[PDB]
Symmetry: D2
Subunit: 113 residues, 4 copies
């Protein structure tokens, strides 16, 4: 699957490989509870984060560790990370969170199908 993340690199023109991604769900006390995590693959994709039964309606945060990514490439970055925060609302739906990274900018879109 219900949740996939895809990351691209606008400087090198490539998938952003080996990027750490953590997903959190907002709790009743307004704190962020860990939900799923992983590293992007050689295609820049992170699959297998969750299952249909685990992924309920609510507010989610996808934190992408952009700073570590740029540093591993020897490139100087602006942001600490990228945080993408959205509501999941329930008919049949799959969500892709896509992000395009540059050192001083990022862009994100949602593909919901």
């Amino acid at each position: 699957c219900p949740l996939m993340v895809k990351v691209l690199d606008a400087v090198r023109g490539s998938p952003a490989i080996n990027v750490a991604v953590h997903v959190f769900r907002k709790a009743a006390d307004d704190t962020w509870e860990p939900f799923a995590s992983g590293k992007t693959s050689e295609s820049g994709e992170l699959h297998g984060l969750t299952t249909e039964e685990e992924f309920v309606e609510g507010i989610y945060k996808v934190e992408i560790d952009t700073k570590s990514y740029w540093k591993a490439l020897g490139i100087s970055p602006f942001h600490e990370h990228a945080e993408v925060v959205f509501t999941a609302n329930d008919g049949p739906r799959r969500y892709t969170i896509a992000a395009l990274l540059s050192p001083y900018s990022y862009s994100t879109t949602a593909v919901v199908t």
Copy 2:
């Protein structure tokens, strides 16, 4: 595959389906010669444009018919089309031209692997 195009819609949060795409190669006389064309699929992707033997080094233009796309959705658009112009340079390489559409803006990136 060597050349793929992928199109997303930033307003609806979906693949951009049924978008006409024409590819041209620049000729010796500096005119644009037709090279390949097709319509994006239900995943927003256009595969099968060319073959390894046909796709040689040179300057290519990918013209995406964004105006017709928005009009078919009932949305008022700014651009006539989106034109993405690049050089192909030869080791082993596959090119993806990705575009993210909004009515008054578009973004494009290249994924070369």
Copy 3:
């Protein structure tokens, strides 16, 4: 003006007007503390958030309330907000412009950093 925010609307081809913006700064105990807030003008710009004296070194978060913007236009948007989190002034004072481009299911930000 060491910190400025500029917001554009990619659907209408316009400045994004009356957008609320909240800035936080990380405290010594690693929590987010309020720092400044304001709203974009008719030009989509927000000036006056802070001063050279107040805008010290630190880790800052700029949260742009994109959800309320779209809802006010009668549109149900995907994201709760657009944001940037960054370390400021580590090599001395700088001027920062955060430029954001909005659609209902997408946003982009960029930083423009200049040395005064």
Copy 4:
């Protein structure tokens, strides 16, 4: 200033300075004819391309020479240019700002259209 161009660099977090910009207008015979050209300033802005009298209805193309920009910085870029093609002034005169954001393998443009 009915037509303005503003360009930012997403790698350096800076205005994109000294960027050449060429504007064309479609002629009655459907070819592109030269209309105006200029280069971005130290702020990444280009003013003065045209006038209210000269900027009539038509189909315009704004070609931003991104290739030369990156090459000047010692970088080999993907695209030949960034562009916009649009019909202008169809419902009366408007003011147009073309805002571009550049990386070596990516670009974004947006239009800001206001009614004078």
